[PDB]
Amino acid sequence: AALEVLFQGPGQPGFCIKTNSSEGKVFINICHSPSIPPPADVTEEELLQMLEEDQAGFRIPMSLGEPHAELDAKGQGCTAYDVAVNSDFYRRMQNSDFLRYLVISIAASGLESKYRLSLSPIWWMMKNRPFMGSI
C-alpha cells in the first residue's frame, strides 16, 4: 500500500513516531515535500469503502528513507527512518486522526517490507521533538 518514491530532499520535518523492532527502538520521521505526489483525492466515505474492498487498497506515495543510526534519551543506539509524503496530504493528515494513523501504519508496513523488520503496533508520537536525528 506504500508506493515508494525515490526522493533526494531533505523535505520539511513533520512529526516523529517512536516504536520498536524485535531488535531495538525505531523512530519514524514523517516528513513532507511538495515534490512527493499526493495519493488519490477521495472523500472519507470513498476511502472507507476502499479499505473494506481491499485492506491495503488506498495507495499512498511516500519515500522510505535509508536507516540512520541515532542515540535515544538513555544513550543507546537505535534506528531512525525518514518517510516523506506530499505536503498538502500532510496538512490533511494533521486534521484527521484516523487518516494520520493510517499513513503511519502504511509507512511502518512499508519499512517492514523494505528493510525486513517487524515493528510494534504500540507506537507513540514524540511531543517535544518533530524529528529524531539531524537537519
Numbering used by the authors: 12 to 146
Quote from the publication.
Crystals of binder H33 display severe diffraction anisotropy. The crystal diffracted anisotropically, and correction of the intensities for diffraction anisotropy was performed. The A0.5 data were used for final structure refinement. The root mean square deviation calculated on 128 Cα atoms is lower than 1.2 Å. The solvent content is probably responsible for the low diffraction quality of the crystals. The molecules in the crystal of binder H33 are arranged in tubules perpendicular to the z axis of the crystal lattice.
Binder H33 is a small protein binder engineered by ribosome display to bind human interleukin 10. Blocking or potentiating IL-10 signalization by artificially evolved non-antibody binders such as H33 could be an important component of the treatment of inflammatory, malignant and autoimmune diseases in which IL-10 plays a role.
